[PDB]
Design a protein around this ligand. Structure first.
Ligand SMILES: CCCCCCCCCCC(CCCCCCCCCC)(CO[C@@H]1O[C@H](CO)[C@@H](O[C@H]2O[C@H](CO)[C@@H](O)[C@H](O)[C@H]2O)[C@H](O)[C@H]1O)CO[C@@H]1O[C@H](CO)[C@@H](O[C@H]2O[C@H](CO)[C@@H](O)[C@H](O)[C@H]2O)[C@H](O)[C@H]1O
Ligand SMILES: CCCCCCCCCCC(CCCCCCCCCC)(CO[C@@H]1O[C@H](CO)[C@@H](O[C@H]2O[C@H](CO)[C@@H](O)[C@H](O)[C@H]2O)[C@H](O)[C@H]1O)CO[C@@H]1O[C@H](CO)[C@@H](O[C@H]2O[C@H](CO)[C@@H](O)[C@H](O)[C@H]2O)[C@H](O)[C@H]1O
Ligand SMILES: Cc1c(CC(=O)N2CCC[C@@H]2C(=O)O)c(=O)oc2c(C)c3occ(-c4ccc(Cl)cc4)c3cc12
Ligand SMILES: Cc1c(CC(=O)N2CCC[C@@H]2C(=O)O)c(=O)oc2c(C)c3occ(-c4ccc(Cl)cc4)c3cc12
Ligand SMILES: Nc1ncnc2c1ncn2[C@@H]1O[C@H](COP(=O)(O)OP(=O)(O)OP(O)(O)=S)[C@@H](O)[C@H]1O
Ligand SMILES: Nc1ncnc2c1ncn2[C@@H]1O[C@H](COP(=O)(O)OP(=O)(O)OP(O)(O)=S)[C@@H](O)[C@H]1O
Ligand SMILES: [Mg+2]
Ligand SMILES: [Mg+2]
Lengths: 264, 270, 264, 270
């Protein structure tokens, strides 16, 4: 079909310091060399419309960095990303203030998200109905519990209509009754032929939601393709890893971290 | 040329959003106080009181200036200082404090310091209305010359805003900036006609000539001309007007250029 | 055996305000009456040594309030709690500062928890080994990822040796390899015949870990007893609730919230 | 009697913890600065410079006091003021800011404002050593009388600490307290011998007699007696010593009583 997201040679580097003298010397001297850490390294993948892609890998692999670079909140050191369409991110807790009440927080967050005044006025009652807070919609958010804060954040955030959606480790929130509502909303979102990027550790959710898999290891793209051809490979690697000794796991992690650090 | 156009368009298209966010900030700041937003007037008033006992009662032995009682001279001269001080001190910190809440959203980033300034402009307007009302008890009633405020109250705002547009970027790249302004602003308080008037024709004459290079000089003197002296200020001091307009334009241009040059990498420095 | 925790007639009330004038008038006038919200209401239960008790209920029920009152961070309006032994709480993110490095954060958090200097010096290397950060132990915590922050917090926090333990919705953190380590630690904790309070929504984890169930509904203690006699009842209630209409659920929630509010 | 005993025991048993937490706070505050902890000395120094140009050069036309150059008089008199100002202003906010991090842990809660004060006492000690070294260039060398500092530097610390022990509790119950101190501290700066000396024998005589009820009077005058005048201060002013000791005791007693009365319900007000 049509390419919606196109990532070409994206690289992300960071500079590692030990004392303030090192930081100042690097800031001043143009030639000064220091250690450099490669968070990402030469990532290339093409996404199509209607593709649901799940990102998999161990801690520190670099999937939040990639989803921030796709989301637009972070910029590559090298390479480029071409987006066809508008991009949105599910970050439920971002715009909530404990000093404000729930009704005020709806307007505050919808304003920060980019909505116009008439749309905010029109869609406030539906959000209030969805969140199911009741009377506590008239109270400061600092008097809430954790589940109610999550429910309000999710209800405000799910009102977007983008072309590209990014979800980072939150598919459903609340108790057993709210989770079904959240899952139904996400499945409706998938039904409309929208491109979705999804980061998770729940492999059952990945199997029942995604259609493509992106395997990230050591800041690199290990593999990329259909779910039924790639997910079994990652699962086999995972099951093999649990069967090594502690020294073998330490050696594997040290070898992985060796290639990510370079003096330059 | 493109940076100026981008920042100008972003500010012009979002007037309502700037006002709304400033109001939400005012609500957030005073949330747990028993009195509420009343402190937005109570804190500036008390500071004036102290400044009257030290510099009016102690020094000067309560001596009038230019045929006016010293209390009203000081009152009209100091009304805009708290707005300038607070606006700059918090606009320097605005982006560092508020980038992460809107980074994932598509937001006009150049308006972040401006609404922080507007939240202080509200209290300035309240205090200025109170000062004009208080000046009527001595016998100083509004004249036609008061219309000059329509040029002078806006200009002050613009000046403050322009400065923050630079010092918000500088404060992200180098944090030590936040410690420098505290020392600079103090110099701008005492070397200004807010509390005292230089003698001129002497060793104080050079100090007066250097003081004329402070924009606070023009702001305070223009306010006093409109409210107290019943004079058209620009009929004798249009060169100072041109100098201050040039200053505001220079600050805005440099701030816009730097902001559009570095805004895409703000996550590195934060 | 011996009663370890004894809760008698614990009640928790909150005062609800709409404008600042109401708040000031209540502060000044001694007789002024206002709305009052009952977060808890006449809770009584006896806990024994070696009991693992799981707290269950829907959002807003009052289990975090009860676990804070048991933990000692909150005080009852009426009634009293008698503890036999020292009490600890698993709050992994509490003492972490993004400005400090990992090594500094270990000492900072262990100092705030109440340890002495010699113990901190002795147990730092084991914590460093457990967290498995590697070189990033020498970097500020604000340069970490989410999984690494959780791993460091858990590794610092699991070093306590209390008589009563309180866990609020965190049994394991990290990827698939760290979760087994966390579960083994928690099972070892259970093996030593320690009293554990556990708050969760995962009913499989509750079935495989706890031995008693405390059902909280509308700020009240609906039931309390053995796992195999009480958990099926809550599961039956939950399965019945999903089969009602939206109006029936709204009516149930409104009826529940009616009894919690009283003017006095 | 029990509240005093509890607070005293909690402070005595945790000397090392107080020092360590103060050091961690100093590290946290200056994390992103290029210069680092050097600002802990740079900020107080610059503020002195301005105060020399306004009150020494402008007013007074650089006139000596009591046979000493004005610069060293002011330098010795102002060295402890920044510590007092900052210590009180942040000790009033300490519990509100830091209760939630230690609430779940079993922690001595009365030591929270004290380590916030200690983090400023460090910079005070550095500045005082610099001032004593700088006084040697004019020809004022240390004498035996300098040993008096062993009573006077501690007392200052205690005074500040006692005040915070009250104003930390008051700041949790009523937030508006945080806005009042800003106005009170200013009054305590100008009505003190830090910048000027009252005339006495006149209308200024009553002001001098009222000024003697300020503890800052005793602090500055005792420091100057030990460093500049080569005099045993207590041989003429032991009544002021007793008055200030009584003040510190009263503040400590009231603060301990209120803190132990309300500490169990701090989560309600926060
Ligand atoms: C008390 C005083 C103490 C000392 C004061 C500070 C001394 C200077 C410090 C330098 C400093 C402050 C700004 C300085 C100028 C601002 C004022 C301007 C005038 C004001 C009236 C920025 O310095 C600027 O860095 C820019 C980099 O964007 C660079 O931009 C352009 O350059 C060319 C055209 O200039 C142009 O061709 C080029 O395309 C541009 O990039 C600028 O040239 C350079 O001046 C901050 O240091 C920065 O730290 C950053 C990590 O936080 C770091 O970026 C990251 O890059 C990689 C990507 O991940 C990765 O490796 C790391 O993440 C990290 O390395 C920067 O490299 C480093 O520099
Ligand atoms: C610009 C100025 C604006 C106005 C200024 C403020 C006006 C006064 C406001 C009163 C105020 C400030 C402290 C006042 C004195 C402090 C200075 C002392 C002297 C200083 C030199 C506290 O007031 C104090 O409240 C104490 C309650 O602990 C009470 O303590 C003792 O009383 C008896 C012995 O006094 C003794 O028998 C008794 O056992 C003690 O309880 C005190 O008597 C009373 O004075 C704050 O208001 C408080 O808000 C709290 C919710 O945050 C609220 O507690 C909660 O209680 C329930 C439990 O969940 C639940 O219903 C709610 O959660 C809530 O209701 C308090 O009820 C309310 O009062
Ligand atoms: C008067 C004064 C000089 C002047 C001074 O002391 N000087 C300088 C050279 C000549 C003359 C002298 O030789 O004494 C000063 O510098 O600061 C002051 C501060 C910081 C002051 O804060 C408060 C007062 C004050 C307030 C009310 C009343 Cl009713 C009375 C007082 C006050 C006076 C002075
Ligand atoms: C001198 C002065 C009076 C005194 C004054 O103006 N008075 C009061 C009654 C008599 C006399 C007068 O009638 O003019 C004052 O009040 O504030 C001042 C402020 C706030 C000042 O900040 C800076 C200076 C200053 C600094 C350096 C140099 Cl080299 C020169 C100046 C400075 C002077 C005065
Ligand atoms: N500012 C930074 N400076 C240096 N390294 C960083 C910085 N931010 C992130 N990293 C490192 O970049 C790597 C990738 O981090 P992330 O992408 O956030 O983690 P992740 O792959 O999503 O895995 P999780 O979230 O822990 S399961 C890790 O080694 C981080 O420590
Ligand atoms: N400060 C407060 N003032 C008023 N009501 C409060 C306050 N804190 C909590 N509540 C209410 O007390 C009730 C119990 O809250 P919690 O015990 O925190 O929630 P919960 O039972 O743990 O359920 P979760 O965590 O959302 S699954 C809820 O209705 C809260 O809104
Ligand atoms: Mg992550
Ligand atoms: Mg909870």
């Amino acid at each position: 079909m049509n390419v919606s997201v196109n990532i070409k040679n994206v690289t992300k580097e960071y500079r590692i310091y030990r004392t303030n003298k090192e930081r100042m010397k690097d800031a001043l001297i143009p030639k000064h060399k220091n250690k450099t850490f490669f968070a990402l390294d030469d990532i290339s993948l093409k996404a199509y419309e209607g593709d649901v892609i799940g990102l998999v890998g161990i801690n520190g692999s670099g999937k939040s960095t990639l989803s921030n670079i796709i989301g637009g909140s972070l910029s590559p050191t090298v390479g480029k990303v071409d987006r066809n369409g508008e991009v949105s991110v599910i970050a439920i807790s971002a715009g909530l203030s404990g000093q404000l009440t729930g009704i005020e927080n709806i307007e505050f967050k919808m304003l920060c998200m980019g909505f116009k005044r008439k749309e905010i006025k029109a869609m406030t009652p539906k959000i209030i109905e969805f969140s199911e807070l009741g009377e506590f919609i008239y109270q400061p958010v600092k008097k809430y519990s954790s589940g109610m804060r999550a429910k309000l954040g999710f209800s405000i955030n799910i009102t977007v209509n983008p072309d590209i959606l990014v979800i980072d480790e939150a598919l459903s929130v609340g108790d057993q009754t709210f989770a079904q509502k959240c899952l139904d909303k996400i499945y409706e979102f998938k039904e409309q032929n929208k491109t979705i990027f999804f980061v998770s550790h729940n492999l059952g959710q990945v199997r029942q939601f995604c259609t493509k898999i992106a395997w990230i290891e050591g800041g690199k793209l290990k593999d990329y393709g259909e779910l039924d051809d790639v997910l079994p490979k990652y699962e086999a690697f995972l099951n093999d890893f649990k069967k090594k000794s502690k020294a073998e796991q330490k050696e594997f992690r040290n070898k992985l971290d060796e290639s990510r650090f370079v003096i330059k | 040329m493109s940076a100026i156009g981008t920042v100008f368009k972003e500010h012009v298209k979002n007037f309502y959003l700037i006002q709304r966010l400033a109001q939400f900030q005012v609500k957030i700041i005073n949330h747990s106080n028993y009195l509420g937003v009343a402190w937005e007037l109570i804190n500036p008033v008390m500071q004036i009181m102290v400044y009257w006992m030290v510099f009016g009662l102690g020094i000067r032995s309560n001596a009038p200036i230019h045929g006016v009682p010293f209390v009203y001279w000081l009152l009209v001269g100091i009304s805009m200082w708290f707005f300038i001080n607070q606006g700059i001190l918090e606009g320097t910190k605005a982006i560092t404090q508020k980038f992460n809440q809107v980074s994932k959203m598509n937001f006009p980033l150049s308006i972040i310091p401006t609404y922080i300034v507007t939240s202080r402009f509200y209290g300035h307007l309240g205090l200025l209305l109170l000062v004009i009302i208080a000046c009527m008890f001595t016998g100083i009633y509004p004249s036609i010359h008061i219309i000059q405020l329509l040029i002078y109250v806006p200009f002050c705002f613009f000046l403050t805003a322009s400065v923050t547009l630079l010092t918000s970027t500088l404060g992200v790249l180098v944090r030590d900036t936040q410690m420098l302004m505290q020392a600079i602003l103090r110099i701008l308080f005492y070397f200004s006609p807010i509390l005292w008037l230089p003698k001129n024709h002497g060793i104080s004459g050079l100090i007066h000539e250097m003081m004329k290079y402070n924009p606070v000089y023009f702001i305070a003197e223009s306010y006093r001309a409109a409210i107290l002296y019943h004079e058209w200020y620009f009929m004798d001091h249009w060169k100072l007007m041109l100098y201050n307009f040039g200053i505001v334009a220079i600050f805005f241009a440099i701030g816009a250029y730097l902001h559009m040059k570095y805004r895409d990498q703000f996550a590195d420095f934060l």
